[PDB]
Every structure is written in structure tokens, then in C-alpha cells.
């Protein structure tokens, strides 16, 4: 019909399928790239995780050993 079959050879293509495929593949990568720039915390973490050993006995209210 509009695409005649072939024998042992690469098939015939239309422009629209190639253009549309390329456009939507780029749209995926623009969307992924754009989101990193704005939402990099969704992948790396929004807030720092404190190191629990860097807290002083004063902060946590640990009294000295003798009393």
C-alpha cells in the first residue's frame, strides 16, 4: 500500500514517524534534565541527616558519671 514490503532489506520509513519519535525522545530528556535543575532534592535528599555522635552530653542532658 503506502509502504511496500521488502525482501532481506531494511524497511521503508515515513518522515513523520522518524520526526515524531525523535521529538518525543527529546521531550523525555528535556523533562528529565529540567527536573534535575529544579528538583535535585527529590533524588539526593531534602534535608541534611545529622550525625548523632556530634551531639554533646549538654544537649542530650547526660549527667556526669559520678552522681
Amino acid at each position: 500500500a503506502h509502504i511496500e514490503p521488502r525482501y532481506r532489506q531494511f524497511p521503508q520509513l515515513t518522515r513523520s514517524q522518524v520526526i515524531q519519535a525523535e521529538f518525543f525522545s527529546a521531550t523525555m530528556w528535556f523533562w528529565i534534565l529540567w527536573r534535575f535543575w529544579h528538583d535535585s532534592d527529590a533524588v539526593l535528599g531534602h534535608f541534611p541527616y545529622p550525625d548523632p555522635s556530634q551531639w554533646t552530653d549538654e544537649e542530650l542532658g547526660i549527667p556526669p558519671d559520678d552522681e
Binding site: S25, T27, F30, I32
Partner: protein, 81 residues
């Protein structure tokens, strides 16, 4: 016949992975007699297929171009506003 078959002389194993198989069988005294029947899969538009990373990166060239423009377009407006 509407259909036409490509000339059968053109199907050759040379320069394709089918050739490499021939030397290996040659070192053993064997030959592969169907090699030409497989040749078409390695020739013409079926040669040089992308790799896995190449496939996953399809569209990266222009998606990146649009992203660089878009952030620059955003970079302008923030500076003004």
C-alpha cells in the same frame, strides 16, 4: 510480479561477523555452507545498530539543547525581574 527479489550474488560473508566464524571453523577443517543465507542480516541498513547506552540516550542531543536554552531563558527573566 510486483515483488522483486534482490540479486543473490550480493550476499557475502566478508566484513561481517559471519566471516569471523569461517576462520574459526577453518582452523578445525570445517566450513559453514549456509553463511550467505545469513548475510543479509549484517548488511545495508541492518548494519551498525546502536548500543544499549546509545539507545537510552536517543534524543539527548536536542533535549539538552532545549534545556540549555530554557534555563538561559529563565536566567534572563530572573535577572530582569
Amino acid at each position: 510480479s510486483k515483488m522483486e527479489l534482490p540479486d543473490y550474488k550480493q550476499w557475502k560473508i566478508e566484513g561481517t561477523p559471519l566471516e569471523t566464524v569461517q576462520e574459526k571453523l577453518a582452523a578445525r577443517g570445517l566450513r559453514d555452507p549456509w553463511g550467505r543465507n545469513e548475510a543479509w542480516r549484517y548488511m545495508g541498513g541492518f548494519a551498525n545498530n546502536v548500543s544499549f547506552v546509545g539507545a537510552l540516550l536517543k534524543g539527548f542531543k536536542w533535549g539538552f539543547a532545549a534545556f540549555v536554552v530554557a534555563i538561559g531563558a529563565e536566567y534572563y527573566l530572573e535577572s530582569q525581574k
